Amino acid sequence: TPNLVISVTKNFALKPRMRKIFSRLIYIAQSKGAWIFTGGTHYGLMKYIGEVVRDNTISRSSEENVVA
Amino acid sequence: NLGPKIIMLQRMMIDVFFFLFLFAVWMVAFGVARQGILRKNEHRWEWIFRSVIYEPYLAMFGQYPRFPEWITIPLVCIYMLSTNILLVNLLVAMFGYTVGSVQENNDQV
Amino acid sequence: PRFPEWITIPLVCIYMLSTNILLVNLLVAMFGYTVGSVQENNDQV
Amino acid sequence: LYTNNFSSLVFKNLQIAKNSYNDALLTFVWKMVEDFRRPITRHPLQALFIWSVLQNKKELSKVIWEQTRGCTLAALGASKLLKSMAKVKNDINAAGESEELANEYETRAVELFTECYSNDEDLAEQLLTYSCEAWGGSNCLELAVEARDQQFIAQPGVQNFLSKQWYGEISRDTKNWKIILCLFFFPLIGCGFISFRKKKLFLYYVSFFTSPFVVFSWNVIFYIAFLLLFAYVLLMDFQKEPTALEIILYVLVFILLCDEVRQWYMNGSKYFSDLWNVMDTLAIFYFIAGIVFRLHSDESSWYSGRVIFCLDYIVFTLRLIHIFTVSR
Amino acid sequence: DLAEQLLTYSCEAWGGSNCLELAVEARDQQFIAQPGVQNFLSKQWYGEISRDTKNWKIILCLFFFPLIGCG
Amino acid sequence: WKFQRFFLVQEYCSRLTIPFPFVIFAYIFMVMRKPSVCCSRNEDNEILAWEAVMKENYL
């Protein structure tokens, strides 16, 4: 693991910018090669992270991958 | 003409050459048709070349096809069609040089 | 000039070449006036 | 949504558009509207998008356009539908706004497709031909052609896709003369003189002859050979009883007749729009008449048939010249 | 509806002239070139005949009297 | 002119099948010879998912 992120979030409503922030975070994790850590799968912010991960893989594929 | 007319002059020579090529192609067919309609007895291979190749040019300008009265009108229509195609090709040769170029940067070319 | 029957085809080709050059020159004479000028300031000239 | 909140004016206008500017998509849309107005439909979001578009609500249509699943296809279809709506002159003020919205959506679609093509070339082309029942069984290319939006076709990516479809399995960047030399000589393709784009060997020979470019050039070459045969037979192979050579010529002409019938069946409306196709067909029929005369075996009819053949020959040569002109 | 009624309106303030009559003599191309007056003129040219009817429809009705009655 | 060329090329590509002299065979063969949902299939779903991601980037 070159670099691993951890996040702690319990429902929360996404804002117009927060989605951009977290999408950028996941893109950087993809670029460097990283592990993300999340607690459970109670839908909300963490579910959005999972959706971003799934979108990224099909968007790029090619070299490397990200792990939740 | 060396100056800003040289691109125009160089494209047009090529276009006119292509038009002349098409005209020659058409003349060969015209000559074959005329020779076939008029003469029948002559089967010599040698005379056929003479006839088909340089009878029509003589007919245009030279010292040297209506035998049948019944098919005159279709012949007239055929003449009209050939006129249409060849006139179109000539006018395209005339006006070809304008489409490709751009007015803003014409000087550099 | 057709006394000889044997050199007719080269004569035809020569005619074609002369036609090409002269027609080109005539069309250039027709369309020469457009290239030099500029549309924006055409009135002053 | 469709029975109550649908403006009566827009419905009356749509009626004219269906009646007198009938289009393939515009009949399916009308059928759906009538069925709703009276399970019924899949792709609900497409139905709502159409409802928003027909009332010319620009912002509320753009909002709903994002949630739709097929974005480029939906935008292209909406532009087409607005084009059809704009051709109604019962109401001018509405037509102007409809046309403006159509242009907006067309530009949006082309921009989005450029963005998609930038990332992955392979998937963009698969997406391009994709077809959905939401519209009348139409893909993006089919919809663009009927919509007559020049920009979408004019853009680079679709042009490249079309060009490599035209070349086929033949690899591009091979200079034309290389292809023609391989065309004349069978063996060269096998050796490697012509490359290819990607039991194994035979596919090279087959795919070299199914590419449209090769077939077109071969057809032109064979047409020239056909004209030479025609001239030879007409000048010094015309006898009281037709010879085998003339019979081969007749067989070739019959092949050509079948080829023409295919154009009649495949696309009938536009084939007769132009004079040149009409001339080709009339030439073949003229030939038929010529045979009718030749077979009578009477000198008086024989000469007339010969004249008919000569004129048909001139017509065929004109067809060839037309081909060369447009090709160049 | 009201714009066209306004267009032909005439007042003695000027020499008994309406907007169209004044525009033609004034030779201002823009006013005539605009869409609305063009549409008014076009539907005057067609008359009570409904527009959007393809020309051949009109010509076929022209040759044959009965068709117009049927619809 | 790009649009016009696309149209003509498309027409020609649709027409041409094989070299002219043998054409009749195919025709004869052809005359002897003579329910899919839009989005149900999974491989069809993948393409639309990719397109949606692309749209998000464009927006």
Tell whether D89 lies on the interface with E, counting CB pairs under 8 A: yes
Residues 6+ apart with CB under 8 A from E9: E18, E19
Closest CB to F18 among D70, D215, D326: D215
Tell whether C16 lies on the interface with B, counting CB pairs under 8 A: yes
Closest CB to D318 among B71, B75, B81: B81
Report the distance separating Cα D46 and Cα D40, nearest Å.
13
Tell whether B63 lies on the interface with C, counting CB pairs under 8 A: yes
Closest CB to E35 among D88, D90, D92: D92
Q: Chain F closest CA to D85's CA: distance in Å?
A: 23
Residue D129 in tokens:
């031909």
Which residues partner with E11 through β-bridges?
Answer: E17
Report the distance separating Cα D187 and Cα D153, nearest Å.
39
3-class DSSP assignment, residue D269: coil
Tell whether E34 lies on the interface with D, counting CB pairs under 8 A: no
Residues 6+ apart with CB under 8 A from B86: B19, B22, B23, B26
Q: How many CB atoms lie within 10 A of CB D234?
A: 21
Closest CB to B4 among C19, C27, C35: C35
Contacts of D96 in chain E (CB under 8 A): 35
Strands A3-6 and A34-37: parallel
Report the distance separating Cα A32 and Cα A3, nearest Å.
7
Alpha carbon separation from E13 to E5, E16, E24 (Å, rounded):
18, 8, 18
Pick left, alpha or beta for residue E51 (phi over 0 → left; psi -120 to 50 → alpha; otherwise beta). beta
Q: Do chains B and D touch (3 or more CB pairs under 8 A)?
A: yes
Tell whether C3 lies on the interface with B, counting CB pairs under 8 A: no
Closest CB to C28 among B5, B24, B63: B5
Longest dimension (CA), chain C: 61
Secondary structure letter of residue A36 according to DSSP: E
Long-range residue pairs from D92-99, CB within 8 A, at least 24 positions apart, any chain: D92/E35, D92/E36, D92/E39, D94/D9, D94/D10, D94/D13, D94/D56, D96/E35, D97/D56, D98/D56
Chain D residue with minimum CA distance to B45: D236
Alpha carbon separation from D115 to A20, D108, F55 (Å, rounded):
19, 11, 8
Chain D residues 227-266 with CB within 8 Å of chain E: none
Residue D319 and residue D279 in contact, taking contact as beta carbons nearer than 8 Å:
yes
Alpha helices (runs of H) in B1-109, residue ranges in sequence order = 6-38, 45-54, 56-60, 72-95, 97-100
Alpha helices (runs of H) in chain D, residue ranges in sequence order = 8-20, 24-37, 44-54, 58-67, 71-86, 92-119, 121-128, 140-147, 150-154, 156-167, 176-184, 187-191, 200-210, 212-236, 244-266, 275-294, 299-327
Q: Chain E closest CA to D235's CA: distance in Å?
A: 48
Q: Which of A55, A60, A61 to mutate to test the interface with F (most CBs of F within 10 A)?
A: A55
SS3 sequence, D199-254?
Answer: CHHHHHHHHHHHCHHHHHHHHHHHHHHHHHHHHHHHHHCCCCCCCHHHHHHHHHHH
3-class DSSP assignment, residue A6: strand
**C35–B106: do the CB atoms touch at under 8 Å?**
yes
Report the distance separating Cα B44 and Cα E69, nearest Å.
73
Q: Chain F closest CA to D7's CA: distance in Å?
A: 31
End-to-end CA distance of chain B: 15
Q: Chain F closest CA to D189's CA: distance in Å?
A: 17
Residue A18 in tokens:
């927060």
Report the distance separating Cα B16 and Cα B94, nearest Å.
8
**C24–B13: do the CB atoms touch at under 8 Å?**
yes
Report the distance separating Cα D38 and Cα D50, nearest Å.
18
Alpha helices (runs of H) in chain C, residue ranges in sequence order = 8-31, 33-36
Contacts of B81 in chain D (CB under 8 A): 279, 315, 318
**B8–C35: do the CB atoms touch at under 8 Å?**
yes
Contacts of D21 in chain E (CB under 8 A): 52
Q: Do chains E and F touch (3 or more CB pairs under 8 A)?
A: no
Tell whether E1 lies on the interface with D, counting CB pairs under 8 A: no
Q: Residue D169 class from Cβ within 10 Å (0-12 exposed, 13-18 middle, 19+ buried)? A: middle
Contacts of F53 in chain A (CB under 8 A): 55, 58-59
Residue D88 and residue D21 in contact, taking contact as beta carbons nearer than 8 Å:
yes
Q: Is the dihedral of CA E17, E19, E21, E25 positive or negative?
A: positive
Burial pattern D24-54, b for ≥16 Cβ within 10 A else e, equals ebbebbbebbeeeeeeeeebeebbebbbbbb
Place of tokens 């753009």: D62
Q: Given a contact as 3+ CB pairs under 8 Å, which chains touch D?
A: B, E, F
Q: Do chains F and C touch (3 or more CB pairs under 8 A)?
A: no
Report the distance separating Cα B87 and Cα D85, nearest Å.
41
Residue D31 in tokens:
């059928």
Residue A3, CB-side half-sphere exposure with 13 Å CA sphere: 9
Q: Do chains F and A touch (3 or more CB pairs under 8 A)?
A: yes
**A58–F49: do the CB atoms touch at under 8 Å?**
yes
Which residues partner with D139 through β-bridges?
Answer: D131
Residue D66 in tokens:
């994002």
**D20–E54: do the CB atoms touch at under 8 Å?**
yes
Alpha carbon separation from D285 to D61, D234, D256, D278 (Å, rounded):
55, 18, 11, 11
Q: Residue F1 class from Cβ within 10 Å (0-12 exposed, 13-18 middle, 19+ buried)? A: exposed
Residues 6+ apart with CB under 8 A from E37: E7, E20, E31
Backbone breaks in chain A (C–N > 2.5 Å) follow which residues?
9
Closest CB to D216 among F2, F16, F55: F16
Report the distance separating Cα F54 and Cα A59, nearest Å.
8
Tell whether B25 lies on the interface with D, counting CB pairs under 8 A: yes
Q: Which of F50, F53, F55, F57 to mutate to test the interface with A (most CBs of A within 10 A)?
A: F53
Residue D152 and residue D106 in contact, taking contact as beta carbons nearer than 8 Å:
yes
**D219–F20: do the CB atoms touch at under 8 Å?**
yes
